[PDB]
Amino acid sequence: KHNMKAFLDELKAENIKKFLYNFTQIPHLAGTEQNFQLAKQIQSQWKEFGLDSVELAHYDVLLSYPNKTHPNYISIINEDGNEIFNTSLFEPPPPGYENVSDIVPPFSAFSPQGMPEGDLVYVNYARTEDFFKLERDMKINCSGKIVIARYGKVFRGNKVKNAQLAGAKGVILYSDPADYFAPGVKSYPDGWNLPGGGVQRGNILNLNGAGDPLTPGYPANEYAYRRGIAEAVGLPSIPVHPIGYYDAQKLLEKMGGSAPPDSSWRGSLKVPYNVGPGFTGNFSTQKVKMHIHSTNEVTRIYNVIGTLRGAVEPDRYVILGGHRDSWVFGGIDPQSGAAVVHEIVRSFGTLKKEGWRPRRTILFASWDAEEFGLLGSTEWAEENSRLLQERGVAYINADSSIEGNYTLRVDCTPLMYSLVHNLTKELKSPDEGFEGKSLYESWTKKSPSPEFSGMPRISKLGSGNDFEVFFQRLGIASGRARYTKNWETNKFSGYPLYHSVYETYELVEKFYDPMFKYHLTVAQVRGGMVFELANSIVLPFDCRDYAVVLRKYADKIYSISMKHPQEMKTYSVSFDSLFSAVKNFTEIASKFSERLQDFDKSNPIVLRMMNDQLMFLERAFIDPLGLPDRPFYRHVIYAPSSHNKYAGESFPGIYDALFDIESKVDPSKAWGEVKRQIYVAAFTVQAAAETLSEVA
Amino acid sequence: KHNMKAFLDELKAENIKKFLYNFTQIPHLAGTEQNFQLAKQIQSQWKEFGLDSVELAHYDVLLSYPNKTHPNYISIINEDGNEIFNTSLFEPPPPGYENVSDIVPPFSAFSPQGMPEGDLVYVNYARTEDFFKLERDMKINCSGKIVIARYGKVFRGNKVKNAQLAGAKGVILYSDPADYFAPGVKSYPDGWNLPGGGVQRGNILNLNGAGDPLTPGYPANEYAYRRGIAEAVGLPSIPVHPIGYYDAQKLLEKMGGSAPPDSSWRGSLKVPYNVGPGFTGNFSTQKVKMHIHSTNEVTRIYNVIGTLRGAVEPDRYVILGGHRDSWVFGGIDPQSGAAVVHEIVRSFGTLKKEGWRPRRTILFASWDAEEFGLLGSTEWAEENSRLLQERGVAYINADSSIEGNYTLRVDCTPLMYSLVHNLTKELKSPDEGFEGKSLYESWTKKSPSPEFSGMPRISKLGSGNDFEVFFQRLGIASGRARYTKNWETNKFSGYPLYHSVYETYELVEKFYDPMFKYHLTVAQVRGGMVFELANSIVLPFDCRDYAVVLRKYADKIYSISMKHPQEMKTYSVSFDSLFSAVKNFTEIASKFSERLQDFDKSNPIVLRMMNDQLMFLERAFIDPLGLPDRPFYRHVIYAPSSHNKYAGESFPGIYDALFDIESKVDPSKAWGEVKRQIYVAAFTVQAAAETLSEVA
């Protein structure tokens, strides 16, 4: 039989390992020749594996690279202007790659050039609340200071935006061992910890979903009209550079001014973590100087797009997508995911060669330039937005397959909760101690849901990966899954070797997944989801699971507002309409579910009608006017947090209207905007509910 | 048989006449009790006629009304401040209606209150080119002047916007006999001409598609959050009032300053048409004073929405819609159209009662508050936008059925050209001299197309009626048809009694259509279109007809640009991408047409696929970011002219970027924006073409 079991049994751990080795021997930086060669290889292999067509889709987008003959670095400079200490020009390469060429040195992609000189202020994680504490409570002014911040807790672009708004003239990012050195584990190559010379690369844009900074709204094709740099979306206005903790120790050890306000501000290095500004008395005339010479340049990128045409509904698309570009070797990010996609394509192609076809069309994508702001996925979706809007059933992301070896992690739309529960109950757990038990059982045991008991945790989608354009711009049901570390020990900073030269095939093979069993489990979960989405007669979405979460989010946002009972009285701020809409959604969704079970199974138009209502339900939460000042975040239920792009926020328009509202100087205006966002949310929920009513 | 002939033969001229009489005995002003009573009547009758459901959908929107105890009027005031001449407080009522109550007096809906006093400037039709001529050529400054403009040529809202931007402090609109008195025809009640005491009502908003001024984007339902007046969309900032030509003669006869610049500026009254400013020497100290006391008020309106559920595709909607609210009796506008819709509903209901159902669902709408800015249609479409986006096949408008008695007029999307040609070839001409000939033959003979010979004229959709939200906001294929006057004699100002108290049942029965044969012909054309759209197995749209017009519009916009060859050289302004896209569209559309003819007729999914490609083709021309500063005009091929809302403009984004470009002070920026709009248009055309490619 050609069923899901046939598909699943064809997936092999050993193939995933061979592909991972193959994809991680040389760097595949976006816009470089090596990454175009790899694209051409994947295109040729997907063709051999049996897909119907495999094409490259290219775009010319703004990228950013250090200047090879003028390297970036930071100094301590004395009153004469002698540079008495210099940060490193490169990470020490790992064993056996010390002769690899074209390792891009650590830098912050999209930083402007400059050589600012000044006194340091230490700003902890440079979160919105860190700056509140500095400015409001401690009275420290960052205006014209260079700020130093530890990586972790929030996306680095938000840190840089927050420093810029505080008036900083430069930002230094570093990895603290508190956040990137796990107790009792050795540094690479002897374990999976970050060495003191290790540095995390990463872009520092604030794109808010725009894609290529120069062409928001439209694909960066051959005739595209580009904004000038000064009108580009999302570029930082102050120089930024990342360093490791050996160098950070040298910059921090002399810090003076105020003490850290409390222990949440202290990392693990042997320094006081003083906030500053500037250095202690003896060194008070030394300053810090950055030298940044990176350049932004329009550069061609390439996505690989494979198609496996559907037998029954070829005009319905189920998409499995993940990126291919890496900062260096990409041993975890992204190639642990790309190897998994490669083996999924191979398995589907095996079934195809024997004459099977899925019911719906399956699109496979190897995206480029994800590391530079989701550019490949977003330019392609801009180009194909009309096809995706009217035909896109679901998007499953496929970046890193592992970030730990403890249990499953799934983030997805409520529409996929039931599908995920059911599929995982049919898969074998790879975990020690759960031999012969289901993945569902191990996952539920190790990662209990906060709400439900007997159920596993499934998180909201945030952002910082290639599903953003599909989910929050276009409203296509989306999900992601990988193996992860313990939620109980999770400091939310990323695995220690994230975006460092030490993320290699050996890291994975030696320390994360030597038998490739977690990789195989993730290939079964991602591939299983794609299979069910592309092949189930009725789309495997349960609208009633959205009803349950909508009530939870409505409770949550009401609770936030209720911290201000006096203002809700004064301005007549009612959540009645939103609760009403969520009640209606629950009632209509219950009735639609009854019809979906009871409908005449013989009638295909009835079937295509009800599958269209399921497909367009995520679509209904899109507001074409977008959220305030963020036109590409159009989903009313979920947006990336305005304070941390990685995190999802629910009822984002109402959340942001309420955030810090006690500080607004015109409360009437502020609470008016809260009411406006309540109206928009209640309306959108009711309208989405009405798409599930009988059609006529 | 229940086929189109059965439907068409059931329509009766005599029923349309009875309904028109019934709908025109009392005024049905939006927001009044009389118009709610009529809504309730139509709801009850559509139920009796056999529709499956008939509901009222209500909204609370901003309307505008004179103050009953403080009437509007204009004076000539002498240096003491005695008002030596006053304009009329009402139109003389026609014979037999002199005792009708609640005739709203002439006023400009949405005018602010004020009593500005000043010197007059005469501005011809207050068109963009009229103001260019005054300011640039004649050096007349309108700043702080009251301007007087004759109605005609362009929508009155554009006149008021243009006066406001010239710095006027008030605007007086009047009907010139040059534009509203046909040679040789008597004034009402003895003929169809406008008497000197006649006045044209009408709103003066510039909504640009927004709907209710207080709730742009969202329906004005019970919990809606409303903008304050100062942030409302589209309201004029200077007082405005309309008058007839007896009163206008009194205001104009004393005009001094400059002579009219040429004869295109002179109407037919016995006055010099001097431009001013102010009056001749002896009267130079007399001024003009307005007194406007109308108020804007949120008021409930009611749409009637009837549903005839489809037998095969109930989730596909074909909509026949026209408004019900009138300025006074609405003998032509809108009730000549509403009577036609009433008889169409009756005929469909007859077939339904015998067991027939159309293939697709048919929605019938009686919209409210069209006269106040398309408010009823637009609030409903805002409420139901997700259903309409994913399910709307077509919208046929049904305002006035007649504006003359000469020949057919059709304005529609190219997608409906073939349907209209074919249907009219099967209908009988009602015209004298074409007895036993087809409507197609009479229409082609009397209204030849400028491009084609052997073909009839079919115009672009403009705006100023209830299809605007469906076509230019949501991208649903739309059309309209009515009987019209001779294009050769057409001065484009409207029929003479437009929006006057003299537009009555008698006007129509005595002077326009005594046998109701033109009404019947229009019921056959509108109803015939709805029938074919709701019942044809393959949707009756021909994508190749869009390809032909796209090439015509691309030629036209290129020709405009080519008036500036030096700048196109300097700034490298190329139309190559747009011509390329139009070529591709033509090629793909030709191939799609071959498949549509050759496809396996047995396969319904193949059928639903190809009907979806046809339905979403108009949808593909929507840009979700909208046109510059006009977020509700989202169609890239057609928008209402920025200088005249009634007229359609093709490639509007490129047209406006080119308009008056030789006057822009930064030509580099201006031609940059031209290039941007070329890129957007070429991209949208290519993307729409790609929706017709094979799907996978």
Ligand SMILES: *[C@@H]1O[C@H](CO)[C@@H](O[C@@H]2O[C@H](CO)[C@@H](O[C@@H]3O[C@H](CO)[C@@H](O)[C@H](O[C@H]4O[C@H](CO)[C@@H](O)[C@H](O)[C@@H]4O)[C@@H]3O)[C@H](O)[C@H]2NC(C)=O)[C@H](O)[C@H]1NC(C)=O
């Ligand atoms: C959840 O679904 C429910 C039930 O299906 C839906 O209920 C609707 O509630 C609205 C809003 O209250 C009702 O609106 C009323 O409609 C009647 C005519 O049917 C009007 O007379 C009412 O207006 C009067 O009263 C108002 C309130 O006091 C006054 O402000 C006003 O001036 C009038 O005097 C009012 O408009 C509507 O009838 C029901 N519909 C149905 C089918 O029951 C509810 O709105 C849904 N929730 C959301 C968030 O959409």
Ligand SMILES: *[C@@H]1O[C@H](CO)[C@@H](O[C@@H]2O[C@H](CO)[C@@H](O[C@@H]3O[C@H](CO)[C@@H](O)[C@H](O[C@H]4O[C@H](CO)[C@@H](O)[C@H](O)[C@@H]4O)[C@@H]3O)[C@H](O)[C@H]2NC(C)=O)[C@H](O)[C@H]1NC(C)=O
């Ligand atoms: C109408 O349809 C046609 C044909 O189907 C479609 O043609 C496409 O044209 C584009 C734009 O010219 C082609 O793009 C080229 O693609 C190749 C790789 O296939 C690139 O090497 C080319 O780039 C080089 O040359 C450029 C131009 O001189 C340089 O600027 C650049 O730096 C590179 O050196 C170029 O990107 C594309 O291959 C074809 N596609 C096909 C299938 O033939 C055309 O674009 C359509 N019109 C519109 C408006 O979409």
Ligand SMILES: *[C@@H]1O[C@H](CO)[C@@H](O[C@@H]2O[C@H](CO)[C@@H](O)[C@H](O)[C@H]2NC(C)=O)[C@H](O)[C@H]1NC(C)=O
């Ligand atoms: C990764 O695997 C690919 C595919 O097996 C290798 O590319 C092949 O290399 C052989 C021998 O050099 C060529 O003859 C083939 O044409 C290549 N095939 C394709 C599709 O490119 C590649 O060498 C491997 N890379 C590494 C680093 O091992």
Ligand SMILES: *[C@@H]1O[C@H](CO)[C@@H](O[C@@H]2O[C@H](CO)[C@@H](O)[C@H](O)[C@H]2NC(C)=O)[C@H](O)[C@H]1NC(C)=O
């Ligand atoms: C840090 O790097 C800087 C720049 O390379 C060094 O300063 C330079 O030293 C060279 C060699 O002595 C001089 O010729 C240049 O004039 C100096 N350049 C600048 C910009 O100051 C500096 O010596 C290094 N400091 C340490 C401690 O290694």
Ligand SMILES: *[C@@H]1O[C@H](CO)[C@@H](O[C@@H]2O[C@H](CO)[C@@H](O)[C@H](O)[C@H]2NC(C)=O)[C@H](O)[C@H]1NC(C)=O
């Ligand atoms: C792979 O799994 C092992 C086993 O759980 C992890 O190591 C254990 O984890 C905790 C530290 O959080 C310790 O208390 C145990 O003592 C560890 N056992 C052993 C044998 O080391 C290991 O951390 C995982 N590898 C990765 C990269 O996460």
Ligand SMILES: *[C@@H]1O[C@H](CO)[C@@H](O[C@@H]2O[C@H](CO)[C@@H](O)[C@H](O)[C@H]2NC(C)=O)[C@H](O)[C@H]1NC(C)=O
């Ligand atoms: C997940 O599996 C459950 C249990 O099989 C499915 O729920 C059943 O669906 C069948 C088939 O329609 C119904 O007749 C049963 O009554 C359902 N059982 C329960 C407890 O609800 C569910 O539909 C599956 N979810 C998905 C998305 O496929």
Ligand SMILES: *[C@@H]1O[C@H](CO)[C@@H](O[C@@H]2O[C@H](CO)[C@@H](O)[C@H](O)[C@H]2NC(C)=O)[C@H](O)[C@H]1NC(C)=O
């Ligand atoms: C317009 O026609 C309607 C429907 O025939 C008339 O309304 C009916 O009036 C009768 C007698 O007064 C009532 O008993 C019915 O209940 C009404 N029916 C409905 C559906 O409203 C109405 O009187 C006519 N109006 C005019 C001006 O002639």
Ligand SMILES: *[C@@H]1O[C@H](CO)[C@@H](O[C@@H]2O[C@H](CO)[C@@H](O)[C@H](O)[C@H]2NC(C)=O)[C@H](O)[C@H]1NC(C)=O
């Ligand atoms: C035009 O109308 C105005 C306002 O009604 C007239 O002026 C008023 O006349 C009455 C009666 O004489 C006075 O009591 C008011 O004081 C006047 N009001 C104002 C605002 O001036 C005026 O007489 C009328 N002019 C003509 C020629 O009929």
Ligand SMILES: *[C@@H]1O[C@H](CO)[C@@H](O[C@@H]2O[C@H](CO)[C@@H](O)[C@H](O)[C@H]2NC(C)=O)[C@H](O)[C@H]1NC(C)=O
């Ligand atoms: C109804 O049709 C008649 C016949 O065409 C129109 O009157 C004629 O039209 C032109 C004026 O444009 C004259 O040259 C003829 O002499 C007229 N003939 C007659 C008998 O009047 C009439 O204008 C139409 N009615 C309306 C309201 O448009």
Ligand SMILES: *[C@@H]1O[C@H](CO)[C@@H](O[C@@H]2O[C@H](CO)[C@@H](O)[C@H](O)[C@H]2NC(C)=O)[C@H](O)[C@H]1NC(C)=O
């Ligand atoms: C308008 O009528 C024409 C002529 O009947 C239709 O074109 C024909 O369609 C048939 C049926 O598919 C084809 O086999 C013929 O070859 C077509 N003839 C020509 C000359 O094209 C046309 O499809 C109708 N248009 C609409 C929208 O229904």
Ligand SMILES: *[C@@H]1O[C@H](CO)[C@@H](O)[C@H](O)[C@H]1NC(C)=O
């Ligand atoms: C990089 O720096 C060098 C050497 O100082 C300079 O000549 C060149 O302009 C720079 N390259 C780029 C791409 O900016």
Ligand SMILES: *[C@@H]1O[C@H](CO)[C@@H](O)[C@H](O)[C@H]1NC(C)=O
């Ligand atoms: C911070 O410094 C700058 C001037 O050096 C000033 O404009 C700004 O107001 C200061 N703010 C505070 C709160 O000290």
Ligand SMILES: *[C@@H]1O[C@H](CO)[C@@H](O)[C@H](O)[C@H]1NC(C)=O
């Ligand atoms: C209309 O004018 C009267 C009488 O001068 C005034 O008392 C009333 O306020 C006005 N009515 C409205 C609705 O503005």
Ligand SMILES: *[C@@H]1O[C@H](CO)[C@@H](O)[C@H](O)[C@H]1NC(C)=O
């Ligand atoms: C028109 O009048 C006002 C001042 O009365 C002035 O601001 C404006 O510049 C004038 N413009 C011209 C062109 O005369």
Ligand SMILES: [Ca+2]
């Ligand atoms: Ca873009």
Ligand SMILES: [Ca+2]
């Ligand atoms: Ca609205």
